[PDB]
Design a protein around this ligand. Structure first.
Ligand SMILES: Nc1nc(Nc2ccc(S(N)(=O)=O)cc2)nn1C(=O)c1c(F)cccc1F
Length: 274
């Protein structure tokens, strides 16, 4: 399924951090593009931690899901690097990076319209996946990549893409899932096989919270043990100061998975705001 890329054609540069059992780097690809012309293309290189070769089967499948479909709001995978000793994904390098970084960094510079346009673009991406019964499983602001910033000169909106989900919570050890509360919905902490299209509506709600909360991580002051007890007492996240999306957040984060609204409904809510 995956186009193979030589390592002579890939240079690793800056570290961009770590995923779950992965190391991420900005890189450079030398390729023949359109019209036989030669290109040096900056790419994203994410490496499965050698200490965790276990999950390579999931590691790659997650990217596979994202590449069988094509959508303006989904990050492109270029292929896999031929290493033999390493499992390396070659993907589109989004210029401005993660949304959570951008929110924190630009706390005050974001009005409600900015958040709304981004919420809509994310809902459009999730609706598209919904039509294809494609479970993402790791929706969060960290995995929202900003292609372009808003342009004030032209009054142009920002544009976002959705990265691949990574290793699937169906195989991640317990300690990781609970660290991902409240992005992982309740039913999946009681049983990871409850992973379902309804999961992505809950995580969307959490991501919406991140977007109004200017980069704060919900429940970050609470440790693993409480994050479980937070779900046992069936608590809801606090209303963000930017409170125009609090109702939608709570409707999305419904402890009953069957009651969470479809993303068609969600879009209609988002569209019905000024
Ligand atoms: N595909 C992709 N592109 C980028 N671009 C990027 C990354 C970092 C920066 S910076 N200056 O550190 O803040 C700037 C641009 N990230 N990315 C990812 O999948 C990705 C992700 F989802 C989560 C975390 C890290 C990632 F790398």
């Amino acid at each position: 399924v995956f186009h193979k890329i030589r390592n002579e054609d890939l240079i690793f540069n800056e570290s961009l951090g770590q995923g779950t059992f992965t190391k991420i780097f900005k890189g450079v690809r030398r390729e023949v593009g359109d019209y036989g012309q030669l290109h040096e293309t900056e790419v994203l290189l994410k490496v499965l931690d050698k200490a965790h070769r276990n999950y390579s089967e999931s590691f790659f499948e997650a990217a596979s899901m994202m590449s069988k479909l094509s959508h303006k709001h989904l990050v492109l995978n270029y292929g896999v690097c031929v290493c033999g000793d390493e499992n390396i994904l070659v993907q589109e390098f989004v210029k401005f990076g993660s949304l959570d970084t951008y929110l924190k960094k630009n706390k005050n510079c974001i009005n409600i319209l900015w958040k709304l346009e981004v919420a809509k673009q994310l809902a459009a991406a999730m609706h598209f996946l919904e039509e294809n019964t494609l479970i993402h499983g790791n929706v969060c602001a960290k995995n929202i990549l900003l292609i372009r910033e808003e342009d004030r000169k032209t009054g142009n909106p920002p544009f976002i893409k959705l990265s691949d989900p990574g290793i699937s919570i169906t195989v991640l050890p317990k300690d990781i899932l609970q660290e991902r509360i409240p992005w992982v919905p309740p039913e999946c902490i009681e049983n990871p096989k409850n992973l379902n299209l309804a999961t992505d509506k809950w995580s969307f709600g959490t991501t919406l919270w991140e977007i109004c909360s200017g980069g704060d991580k919900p429940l970050s002051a609470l440790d693993s043990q409480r994050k479980l007890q937070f779900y046992e007492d069936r608590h809801q996240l606090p209303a963000p100061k930017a409170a125009e999306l609090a109702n939608l957040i709570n409707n999305c984060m419904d402890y009953e998975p069957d009651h969470r609204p479809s993303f068609r409904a969600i879009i209609r809510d988002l569209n019905s705001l000024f």
